[PDB]
């Protein structure tokens, strides 16, 4: 087998055995992969998956093959991967174009050796997406592969976002399933795997002390909430900035003061408009937001000396490291490790106390310095993936005639009755025990014994 | 000369009346209402028939109503839950309100009908405020032609909802509902960090009782139980959670709380040897949250360890099978909401039995039973959403509306998330945070107006 | 039976069900008292108690009784007693004179009713004490008393203090038991009974949301952590002020943000050296040093408008409540609840939004607007009352020798063996279940198995 | 041309060297001291012999020991706590170093004879810088003679305090000691709070195990047993602790945790049925913190639910009996030290066995073992007090007293507590706290200088 690029064969009998381990860890995953084996429900499917490279993607990748599919696989991020587990799938025979530290030049390759079969465009009909870059590319640089494609599975926030606009734009060829918005996935992973790998990811970057220090976190959604509990639980004081009342309110409710970095909340992009008082005393700043330089220029300026900034949204261009990269001196401390010097570009004294320490170069800094979720969290994540590559390779949408393929275009989510089947697994994992109605209960709230247990509605 | 109403003790209304001056300063969103809206008088004409706990929150809220133009008739959604100053200074105000802490049921039904009756005759009522829904079916079952002319009902509480979703199904709902509960600023507020705060409350009240390092059992991990189990494992306790719902108990489990059932392997096959009596004999404290029928039943009662404390935070009592605790055991009052019930035998007790448990305020919510609900502060939001509410159904006019416009309207829907954020604003406001305003570049990139609404109506917060 | 004066007798049959629920929560306490009953170590005590009148002393009351001592009673404060529980005890014919609500003078009049009986001087033998008001005036006004008294046991640290300026004053006529410094009195009952009690009192005085509002807590020692967390639990964001580098060192450990009301941490005596800025944004302040003037009038002025005001050390002087009698209008809310009104002294608007909210008039506030520690607390710093009562008695220092006392005259820790063995009869409340060492286990770290398993230097 | 020292790779200098200047930053007590006693070189002639983790935190206090005037050899106290671009640094510094990551016990005990001898005999050492008691205990069993000119130990750690005890009762202690773990700002700062950032670190270095929901055992509950459950109870673990001190049990119960035992009430009978087979069975992670003996046994081991972490945060191995699991299980290494124990039998195992336990480092202690240890900004504490005790014992010059002088001084000892206080200022200060003076008036109402120091010596704050 050669039909791969990963940065070291050598490392795949160590990734085979956290392989072994995440197995006992995904219970969920693991659950499907014994119910759906001898029927083989992907059998024919022929799927491209641009994922982070990690352990819990490799038993997601050996889950859909398990059940019948062929995949080409990369990762979405040039720093996400895991070496071991990008080693241990190529040595599976699975073609997988992944390791951590890409160049950008790199991670466009990657995405075309699993698009592209030994010269020529694959002969796939499904898409496992994270972020929507391979998304885009179909659509924009791909069109003809689409006609022969039944639907695409999307992660995370961010690229549901962008399915939506091509939704509206009546520019989306085929139909998603947008994964991100079960309860299992973004209840679980967004909100509780940044709670467990923030913290992760700073102490093995620069293995600072966090209690008892200053932290600003960005935004207040799922990823908001998870991180800002992260360093919470470690005794950083945190504050919080959102634009959404309510999101505020509810960190108030959480007991985080809500700051903004600009006087009275409004950007007039003037330094004079920077709360300098404010980030003179902060020493972490984290963004969470999945918009565009909510971390800016003039900020950076203004943090106190020796802070540490991250991001933990999908794209980095939370931060602005360009102005980063145009005016000040970038020292290497160790990969994804860099101190930011702000006297000047071209040169800094070894003793320098003014810097900021910029984590994975400004991309997601769970898996850029650590290893992003535990695998018992992304169970449930990868469990609703599997569920929806199903869904959606057993309706055939490239092959229905046009007047049907009108009818089932659409972004929709997972029944919530196949929530609960995932939940359910997951708290078993736990040792819980969740407790049956009685028929005179299940009436009394007017549901089935079954489920589903809420409407629609419920935000739980 | 004002005589209509009926009040604990009318010398407490100066008392009263201090509270609401502190609480008002505690409700920005509410009070930002009465400011914002004083002038233009939009509740003016609307005969408001509004039945909740009758505390000082509710005072502002009636207050508000009333300072928009509204009259309204008030009563307590439950027995215990009047705080007699607050009902007092009310009607020291001139408003006609009937409730008192520890009504008898019967008492209750009359207070309603007080409400409902003025002068022996049917008030001219437009509009509804309820918690629960008891005076929504008592309406609806028995004074069908005051609904001709009630432009609409505002809902408060889940179980209220549920039964309003249950007649707009049968058929049988007369007039259109806002459903206040599943507003963020309620449901995600009220609902859970109001138990947060008055949880613990009632019970340090009512016993005293040092809570670190016990063992707490909470049936149910919805907003209530999510709520509650923080009240309890914030104190120190070592929480377990009881749920049904596996997408709940997910929560529960990553919020680090075991998930166990009452019953073996969560079959309640209603036989007791299905209760855990291992589990059970361990629990000093078992706490209702479901809004459900018998999660707290008699297997358990028996089965719980010595001395526990059983009480419930759901709307209605019912969630616990007090009714086999009054017909088995001797029921011994410590104080006002606060019983021994000895599991010795029916007819009388030792002074010094060992083998009894510790009942809040004979099973009704006991937030309210023992304290004094959830603080103003949370409040202010749930209330600022039922004045909203009684601003748009108001406006609507549904009983003006010919038949078949009335049709397109009959519905239970929630207010829309711009308001749900504007109150949330005054709410942030009030603890002095300040939210960022959005670029028009930003607001571009992620699709929104830089005004809000900031997410998709599928957002679950 | 006359010898009493309470509230209310009536409330006896009330204060008798909680003492029998008190009796349930108190394990240490009652295991003495059947333990010694037989024995009756106390037959022939006459002990001058001087401590709130609670549920929690009526069953440290009534274990001294039942041990074989008799007792006249009275609280050391004017808000601490529970009348139904003086009702109790007076009911069972044991002299006590003390009611919530009490005047100065009538707080005099209690311990001297407790000094005399048929106005002469009681023949007493032993004094326990909280806070040192009844040593003070023993010493000062009966000196000829402490002829015949054998001990003191002092319940606070402040008691302990002034225990420790008569010694070292040469003062000091009986020997004392600082009860304070066991562990399982100042690191459960100063802490924990605080963390317990404080947020208790602010609810039930306010009725206020504490989560998302800003409190400054005025010490971070037993109390003062406490404290902190009483609030932090509840979701306020705490800062914290300190005199003890170590214990602002802990602050910060413990995720709070050290700060001083005063610009650099020096209080000159003038408004300028007030930190205005910070004091603006304070919604709860918080007193727990047992020093003075702590909470100066300053610092009053610069606090935010419609701020909670209290105090949790043992005198009413650390905040300078005489300063806002003189120049502020009381307006009373409910008892024990006043609004101060900056606005004047000649008369306040009812409406008036500038104003401060006063806790039990500055006294300790948890058990002024609550009931102060709960029994299963308070079982452990009254269970050391009882080991003390007994050591100081069985010593019988008045009938000694002057050469034999003077040999004894000091002030004492209990052994740590003793210590221990309360700590076990409560963790066994709880259903804990300690390890027993092996002898190999307890060779190897030098100790018994059956304790003591720590130096004497061990801070726990 | 400098070759005295041995490190895994002198390359990594450079690297060691980045981490060590932004450690300066994160230690101002130690670099207060480094500033504040540089011109007057309190340590000139002073001669080193220190063992302890030679990590970069020992960097910083090796470093600020020579920038005051001390000459050093150093060795680690444990075989995989080195980091290696540290020792990489130092030594590229002209500092003897003999220390690397993953050293075997000869190894070890060849790299602390490293520093005791210089070209073949004894170096001219006159100091000891020791954390465990091993360095100075070879000395007194090997070279008594080193130890006529040693003017005294400075110990960090309990289980090296304890030794050093022992040596005092037994007449055996050649040389005076500090005890430095008992300063507050070392233990109840670096043994705490320490484990409570570092415990839940390495765990998931070596893991990557999701903590929240699961279950968690931590033998002991002293200072560092106290920080292990803080680490894990914070992640959302449900946190079981075991003690035999009634008193820190009473505290983990006010603490919020279940105090249990592994045996049947406690107590080990010598059996397997003397074992709680249904309470280990359900434990996820064990981690022992006690300095004691056998305290996670053979028994304990076969018990223990499938699956499970086993580590060891105090200092020395013996806490578990890895002993038992090597003569009876076969070892799988998943990474450098971390390792799956086939309960399965001796000989081999299946692959994908599903009856393993998880060991971390071997059993050596986990924090330095799969991460760093403790952060900068903590062991800025323990290693100013370290700096602060060797000038106090080099300055008192104990070998060049006579006989009956040494009689008097021979002792181990804390610093005073003004020494702990200023310590303490330093780290408030890096936070950015501020501390509040007191004013004459105060200071004389408490009975303490406007300095301090502000407890008696008694305070177990
Ligand atoms: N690294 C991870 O493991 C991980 C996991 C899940 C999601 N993500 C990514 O993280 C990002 C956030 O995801 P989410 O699910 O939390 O989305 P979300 O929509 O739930 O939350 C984003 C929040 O940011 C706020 N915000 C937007 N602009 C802001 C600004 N200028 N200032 C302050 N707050 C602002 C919004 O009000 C919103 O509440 C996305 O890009 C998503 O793909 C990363
Ligand atoms: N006292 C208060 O101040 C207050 C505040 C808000 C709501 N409430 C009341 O509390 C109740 C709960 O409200 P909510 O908003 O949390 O509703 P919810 O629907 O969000 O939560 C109820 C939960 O109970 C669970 N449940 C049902 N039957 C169960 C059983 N047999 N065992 C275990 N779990 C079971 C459900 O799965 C659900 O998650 C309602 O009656 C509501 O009106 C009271
Ligand atoms: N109300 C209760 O239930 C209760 C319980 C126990 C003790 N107490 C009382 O509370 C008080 C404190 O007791 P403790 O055991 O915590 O004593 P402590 O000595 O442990 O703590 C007092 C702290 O206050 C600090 N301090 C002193 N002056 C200060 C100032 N001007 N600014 C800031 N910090 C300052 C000291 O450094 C010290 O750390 C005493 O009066 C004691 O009797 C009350
Ligand atoms: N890894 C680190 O970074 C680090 C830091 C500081 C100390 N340490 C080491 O950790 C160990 C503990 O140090 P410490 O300061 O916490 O000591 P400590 O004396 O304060 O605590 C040890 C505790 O273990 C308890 N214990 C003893 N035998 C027990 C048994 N069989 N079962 C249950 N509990 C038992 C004791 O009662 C005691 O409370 C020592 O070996 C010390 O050198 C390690
Ligand atoms: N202090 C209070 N005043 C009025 N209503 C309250 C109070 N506390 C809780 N509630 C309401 O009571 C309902 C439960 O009956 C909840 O929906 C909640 O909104
Ligand atoms: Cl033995
Ligand atoms: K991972
Ligand atoms: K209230
Ligand atoms: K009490
Ligand atoms: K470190
Ligand atoms: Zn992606
Ligand atoms: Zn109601
Ligand atoms: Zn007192
Ligand atoms: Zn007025
Ligand atoms: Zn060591
Ligand atoms: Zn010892």
């Known amino acids: 087998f050669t039909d791969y690029k990963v940065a070291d064969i050598t490392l795949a009998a160590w990734g085979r055995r956290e392989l072994i381990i995440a197995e006992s860890e995904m219970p969920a995953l693991m659950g499907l992969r014994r119910k759906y ?9 022929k799927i491209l998956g641009c ?3 990690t352990i819990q993607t490799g038993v997601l990748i050996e889950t859909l093959v398990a059940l019948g599919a062929e995949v080409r696989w990369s990762s979405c991020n040039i720093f996400s991967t895991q070496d071991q587990a990008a080693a241990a799938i190529a040595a599976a025979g699975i073609p997988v174009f992944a390791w951590k530290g890409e160049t950008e030049e790199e991670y466009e390759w990657c995405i075309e050796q699993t698009i592209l079969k030994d010269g020529q465009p694959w002969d796939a009909n499904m898409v496992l997406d994270d972020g929507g870059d391979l998304t885009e590319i179909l659509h924009k640089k791909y069109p003809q592969m689409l006609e022969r494609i039944h639907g695409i599975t999307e992660e995370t926030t961010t690229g549901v976002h962008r399915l939506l606009d091509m939704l509206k734009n009546g520019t989306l060829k085929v139909p998603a399933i947008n994964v991100n918005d079960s309860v299992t996935k973004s209840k679980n992973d967004n ?5 467990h790998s923030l913290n992760d990811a700073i102490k093995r970057g620069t293995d600072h002390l966090l209690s008892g220090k200053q932290a600003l976190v960005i935004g207040y959604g799922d990823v908001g909430k998870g991180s800002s509990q992260s360093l919470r639980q470690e005794g950083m004081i945190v504050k919080v900035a959102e634009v959404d009342p309510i999101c505020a309110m509810q960190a108030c409710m959480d007991g985080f003061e809500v700051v903004s970095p600009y006087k009275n909340g409004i950007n007039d992009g003037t330094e004079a408009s920077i709360d300098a008082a404010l980030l003179g005393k ?26 540490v900034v991250c991001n933990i949204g999908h794209f980095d261009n939370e931060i602005d490291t360009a102005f980063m990269r145009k005016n000040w001196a970038w020292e290497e401390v160790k990969p994804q490790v860099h101190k930011i010097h702000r006297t000047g570009k071209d040169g800094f004294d070894a003793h320098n106390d003014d810097y900021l320490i910029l984590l994975a170069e400004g991309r997601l800094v769970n898996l850029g310095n650590a290893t992003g979720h535990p695998s018992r969290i992304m169970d449930g994540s990868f469990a609703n993936q599997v569920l929806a590559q199903i869904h959606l390779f057993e309706q055939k949408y490239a092959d229905l005639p046009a007047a049907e393929k009108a009818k089932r275009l659409s972004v929709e989510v997972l029944p919530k009755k196949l929530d609960e089947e995932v939940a359910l697994e997951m708290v078993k994992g736990f040792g819980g025990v969740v407790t049956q109605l009685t028929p005179k209960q299940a009436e009394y709230i007017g549901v089935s014994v079954e489920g589903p247990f809420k409407p629609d509605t419920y935000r739980y």
């Open 37 to 45: 084996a001898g029927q083989q429900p992907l059998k024919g499917a």
């Open 191 to 195: 909100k509780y795997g940044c709670r």
């Open 51 to 53: 994922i982070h490279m």
């Open 282 to 307: 902060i020493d972490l700043i984290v963004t969470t937001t999945g918009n565009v330089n909510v971390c800016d220029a003039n900020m950076l300026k203004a943090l106190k000396k020796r802070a």
